[PDB]
Structure 1
Amino acid sequence: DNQFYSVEVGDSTFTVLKRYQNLKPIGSGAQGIVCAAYDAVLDRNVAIKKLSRPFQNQTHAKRAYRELVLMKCVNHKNIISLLNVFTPQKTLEEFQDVYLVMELMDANLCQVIQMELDHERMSYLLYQMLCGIKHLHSAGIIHRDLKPSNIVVKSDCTLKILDFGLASFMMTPYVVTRYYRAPEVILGMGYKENVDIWSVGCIMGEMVRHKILFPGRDYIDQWNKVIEQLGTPCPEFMKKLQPTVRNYVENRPKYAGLTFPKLFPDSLFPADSEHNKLKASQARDLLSKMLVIDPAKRISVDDALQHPYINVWYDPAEVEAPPPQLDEREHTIEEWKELIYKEVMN
């Protein structure tokens, strides 16, 4: 008689509204377990993510409340839009789980990275990534943690971002990915909008190379791979570092740094025709303006949107959606539960 029913996807239990049918697992998609389903009311397929007791600790709760708030705060075709938010529980007292429903896409960006892509679809994905990031920046949201696993793609090239990024101690055997974070994040520097441009460059370079550009067990190894390939930054960059990090970075073995022709040889790009020959040099040129250690010498979102490799997709109304209440501090489990429950019920 109630509007909910229970199914077992994996070893997880999905209690969802009776409008969603034929639940099957898909991918990881951060912060829990996600399902594909058919929505009988909308006559379309959807993705449903379960947030199991998001108020169980500060890290889970601060992020969950931040997501739930910020999603009815953005409106752009390359940023996640929720079709529905619900909890099967009736009261605050019994409140346990939150379910997020969104349009069903087809694949991670990780899977697309493994593929061998043409310039037309490559640049269109980066175009959509830059538009979504521009929208977030214009809404006063600087991500700082873009990664392929949090960007979903459709078969027709459409792309959406999922997570809104950073704002700590976890208990599970689930590890965070850090390879796409900017030197500002690795070195605790204070940042600006183009901190997300470094992440786009890491993604674009991985699409070309089919290898993580800057892998490592932690920031120690990750930093070595940055300076090994890009070289030690100029004395101006390091002047802007805090004394302690300053000493560790000044004393790291100096590296000359390879040029971008040798970092991404023409072998990695299609270049059997004249069109592909030109697009390869354009693609490599943008990479060299994005994979810059010093954020003062790093290209901005707006400048990269006007890059010849990118601007072939520009259209009058395509990022023209201005933002249509704020973060909190230290709360307890009881307080985060009530805060999250209110946002769910409105």
Structure 2
Amino acid sequence: DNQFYSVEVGDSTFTVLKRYQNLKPIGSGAQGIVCAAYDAVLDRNVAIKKLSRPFQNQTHAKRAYRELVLMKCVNHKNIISLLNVFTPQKTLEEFQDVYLVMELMDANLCQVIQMELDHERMSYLLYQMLCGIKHLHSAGIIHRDLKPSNIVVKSDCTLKILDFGLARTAGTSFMMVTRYYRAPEVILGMGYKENVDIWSVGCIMGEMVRHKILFPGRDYIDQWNKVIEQLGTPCPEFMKKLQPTVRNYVENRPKYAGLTFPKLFPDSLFPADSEHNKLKASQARDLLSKMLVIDPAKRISVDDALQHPYINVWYDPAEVEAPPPQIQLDEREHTIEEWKELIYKEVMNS
């Protein structure tokens, strides 16, 4: 501990470089302790994340290696970037902790989502989401678990995605707590395509309008009921694309016509008494009717969503058509000891 010092932050021991001062707690759970700090060397505020038990198991180590490699290789304004990475331990043998240093954002989408919406801020947040998701897809990264807690925003309304989800897997399976934003093809295990992340964007948008989670529930069974009660029972063609065992339960459910999108998202939930606000309520509802579609064969793509009148007002080829990032590796299994060495070399060679 020459260039390092210790400090207790939010019931967690932070052994960080002497350049990071005035550490303040900001977040924790379901895996990872985060705090805010001032970088003396850069004269800027940062966010420092201490990884929670990265070598407890192979899933933690695979997810830690994946996140560290992707945060380094990706360089997009709508995806959180890695400013610095360090370990207070001097050797591979002693190595046990990883500290990721990133730009400090003002709030999480979980609180911004609760704000009284204006079409300007709302369309801008969704535009940035679609931009970041487009950039991940270009590199073959299908998130599959996009949620408000995985997204951070700044005072100027600029947005960044924190996570990469299941990333480069193949796929549609997570074993760990918030499943309200997962696409039906993921829930029912049908296989996914790139527009699987569009359902999650639809869920988040619907929530910005309603100020209530669209599809809540104790479990998937309860969650699927909330989907069919509101959007209606899917077409026989979709239920045909299900394998016989889950198909049996889905087809045995009571048939629902589903509430129309005017009834799901009435004008009451939208800014009123202006011609511009009237126009914008129907455009927002129309985009929801294209994103919140059970059948992924009929759901809108990221590219077409960016082309929608509600979003296209922000379209900038410099932000949207940016070059995809290129590249042990990201679908091969290793022992926990082997992930530790892969993780140690990433922290050291940066």
Range class of TM-score, shorter chain: over 0.9
Q: Are the counterparts in 2 of residues 49 and 99 from structure 1 also a CA contact under 8 Å?
A: yes
Q: Are the counterparts in 2 of residues 50 and 98 from structure 1 also a CA contact under 8 Å?
A: yes
Closer, same or farther: CA 168–55 of 1 in aligned 2, 3 Å: farther
Aligned mates of 2:53, 2:235 — CA distance in 1 = 47
SS of the aligned residue for 2:34 comes to strand
Task: Provide the alpha-carbon RMSD of the alignment.
Answer: 1.5
Aligned mates of 1:52, 1:260 — CA distance in 2 = 42
Q: Are the counterparts in 2 of residues 29 and 150 from structure 1 also a CA contact under 8 Å?
A: no
TM-score (norm 1): 0.96
Instruction: Give 1:203 shift.
Output: 0.2
Deviates more, 1:317-326 or 1:277-286: 317-326
Q: Are the counterparts in 2 of residues 266 and 280 from structure 1 also a CA contact under 8 Å?
A: yes
Closer, same or farther: CA 246–125 of 1 in aligned 2, 3 Å: same
Aligned mates of 2:173, 2:86 — CA distance in 1 = 27
Instruction: Give 1:30 shift.
Output: 5.3
Closer, same or farther: CA 131–30 of 1 in aligned 2, 3 Å: farther
Query: Match for residue 269 of structure 2?
Result: 268
TM-score (norm 2): 0.94
Provide, for residues 212-244 of structure 1, a one-character-per-residue CA deviation record: whole Å limited to 9, x for no partner.
000111110000100010011001111111121
Closer, same or farther: CA 327–169 of 1 in aligned 2, 3 Å: closer
Q: Give the alignment of 1:1-346 within 5 angstroms.
A: 2-28=2-28, 31-166=31-166, 176-324=177-325, 326-346=329-349
Deviates more, 1:256-265 or 1:321-330: 321-330
Instruction: Give 1:260 shift.
Output: 0.4
Aligned mates of 1:304, 1:326 — CA distance in 2 = 31
Instruction: Give 1:169 shift.
Output: 8.7
Provide, for residues 158-215 of structure 1, a one-character-per-residue CA deviation record: whole Å limited to 9, x for no partner.
00001101288978xxxx1100000011011111000000000000000000110001
Instruction: Give 1:130 shift.
Output: 0.2
SS of the aligned residue for 1:31 comes to coil
Provide, for residues 68-125 of structure 1, a one-character-per-residue CA deviation record: whole Å limited to 9, x for no partner.
1112221110011100011111111111110001000000101011110200000000
Provide, for residues 33-83 of structure 1, a one-character-per-residue CA deviation record: whole Å limited to 9, x for no partner.
101000011110000000133011122111111111112221110011100
Number of positions where the alignment pairs a residue of Structure 1 with one of Structure 2: 342
Deviates more, 1:213-222 or 1:72-81: 72-81
Q: Are the counterparts in 2 of residues 29 and 149 from structure 1 also a CA contact under 8 Å?
A: no
Instruction: Give 1:252 shift.
Output: 1.3
Aligned mates of 2:215, 2:310 — CA distance in 1 = 24
Aligned mates of 1:126, 1:207 — CA distance in 2 = 10
Instruction: Give 1:29 shift.
Output: 6.8
SS of the aligned residue for 2:320 comes to coil
Aligned mates of 1:266, 1:214 — CA distance in 2 = 21
Aligned mates of 2:218, 2:138 — CA distance in 1 = 34
Aligned mates of 1:199, 1:43 — CA distance in 2 = 37
Q: Are the counterparts in 2 of residues 198 and 290 from structure 1 also a CA contact under 8 Å?
A: yes
Aligned mates of 1:7, 1:127 — CA distance in 2 = 39
Aligned mates of 1:93, 1:28 — CA distance in 2 = 27
SS of the aligned residue for 2:128 comes to helix
Q: Are the counterparts in 1 of residues 32 and 51 from structure 2 also a CA contact under 8 Å?
A: yes
Instruction: Give 1:28 shift.
Output: 3.5
Q: Are the counterparts in 2 of residues 59 and 168 from structure 1 also a CA contact under 8 Å?
A: no
SS of the aligned residue for 1:35 comes to strand
Closer, same or farther: CA 122–229 of 1 in aligned 2, 3 Å: same
Q: Are the counterparts in 2 of residues 59 and 169 from structure 1 also a CA contact under 8 Å?
A: no
Closer, same or farther: CA 29–116 of 1 in aligned 2, 3 Å: farther
SS of the aligned residue for 1:105 comes to coil
Q: Are the counterparts in 2 of residues 227 and 255 from structure 1 also a CA contact under 8 Å?
A: yes
Q: Are the counterparts in 1 of residues 173 and 186 from structure 2 also a CA contact under 8 Å?
A: no
Aligned mates of 1:36, 1:177 — CA distance in 2 = 25
Q: Are the counterparts in 2 of residues 75 and 321 from structure 1 also a CA contact under 8 Å?
A: no
Deviates more, 1:309-318 or 1:290-299: 309-318
Gaps of 5+ in 2: 167-171
Q: Equivalent pairs: percent with the same residue?
A: 100
Q: Are the counterparts in 2 of residues 73 and 323 from structure 1 also a CA contact under 8 Å?
A: no
Deviates more, 1:333-342 or 1:297-306: 333-342
